[PDB]
Amino acid sequence: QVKLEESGGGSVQAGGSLRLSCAASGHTYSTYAMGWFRQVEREGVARINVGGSSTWYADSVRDRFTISQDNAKNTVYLQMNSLKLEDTAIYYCTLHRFANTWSLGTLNVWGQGTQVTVSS
Amino acid sequence: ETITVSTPIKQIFPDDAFAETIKDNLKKKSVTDAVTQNELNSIDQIIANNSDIKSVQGIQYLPNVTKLFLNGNKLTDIKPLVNLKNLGWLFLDENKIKDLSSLKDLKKLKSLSLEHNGISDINGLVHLPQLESLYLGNNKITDITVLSRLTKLDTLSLEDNQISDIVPLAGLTKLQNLYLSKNHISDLRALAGLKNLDVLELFSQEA
């Protein structure tokens, strides 16, 4: 009954910016891990502890992408700057109560996915 | 130890559900298909949650498995895991595992989940001092003394147990995410020196 509502995506020019959003509904968690994987096998991109402050980023996106939260709104945001051709992929919002298990993907709640295409 | 010559999956894995798990993992046509030790050596991850598995006999022949998902099965005996030296992540929620001595030499194990197994005695977890994540929610645990040896833990869930004494957690300086809801805790003094916590949940105690 956990639902992930994804917003954002599409086509962007190399060097440009894009912001994704994901809001989690139908849960009771005081704190939980939410963020994005992508599939250009699926790999983690960015995670934040909703209700905490800890984050994790893949090495390839660390200083170009920034993940944030609105705890009361149960929403996370991914600000993708200096976009590169290597960032073209389907991006999936995804959630687990525990950050270290979130990293594995296998047991997570998964969103539908959004197409991101970086050109030029 | 090893499968010396090619052998049907059905013969190596007597549990019909686990044999089907292996068949599907290797994308074989039938559990009667024969496999070599070389093919079994290729398995690094098994996803077999909610699969009505009563025995993982045969898993001894998968030396390279590092991720093992067995939540929601009918296991009581994990002796076949004893010598899986490369196991890193082990999920065993909603089984009925009580004898933990077979975990003792899983010295690469980083993450262990044993939620909702009816466990009370966790003394055997003292032999996993390298563990980084430990999930024991929804059990019958009172005495967490041995967790004081698990100095590398950064994530620990003990929610929904019978704990009142958390002094054994005082020295676990690397804890970041700690879940203690639904216990018998009134006194958190022993946690005052943990400096790296991001998450600490204490809801709904019964004093």
Please classify residue B40 by burial: count the beta carbons closer than 10 Å to its beta carbon, then call 0-12 exposed, 13-18 middle and 19+ buried.
Answer: buried
Distance in Å, alpha carbon of B45 to nearest chain A alpha carbon: 11
Residue B172, amino acid: L
User: What are the Cα distances from residue B114, in Å, to A114, B89, B139?
Assistant: 35, 12, 9
Q: How was this structure determined?
A: X-ray
Start-to-end C-alpha separation, chain B: 50
Distance in Å, alpha carbon of B72 to nearest chain A alpha carbon: 13
CB B84 within 8 A of CB B63: yes
Q: Are A52 and B199 an interchain contact pair (Cβ–Cβ within 8 Å)?
A: yes
Q: Are B177 and A99 an interchain contact pair (Cβ–Cβ within 8 Å)?
A: yes
Q: Resolution of this entry in Å?
A: 1.6
CB B141 within 8 A of CB B163: yes
- Give the domains, in start order, of chain B with CATH numbers: 1-207 (3.80.10.10)
**Residues of chain B found within 8 Å of residue A54, distances taken between Cβ atoms:** 176-177, 198-199
**Residues of chain B found within 8 Å of residue A104, distances taken between Cβ atoms:** 67, 89
| Interface contacts A/B by beta carbons within 8 Å | 41
Q: Tell me how far apart the alpha carbons of residues B105 and B166 are, in angstroms, rounded to a whole number.
A: 27
User: What is the domain count for chain A?
Assistant: 1
Domain range for A99? 1-120
In chain A, alpha helices (H): 99-102
Is B44 part of the contact surface with chain A (CB cutoff 8 Å)? Answer: no
The torsion angles phi and psi of B2, rounded to 5 degrees, stand at -135, 150
Q: Are A51 and B199 an interchain contact pair (Cβ–Cβ within 8 Å)?
A: yes
Distance in Å, alpha carbon of A37 to nearest chain B alpha carbon: 19
Is B138 part of the contact surface with chain A (CB cutoff 8 Å)? Answer: no
DSSP SS3 for B82: coil
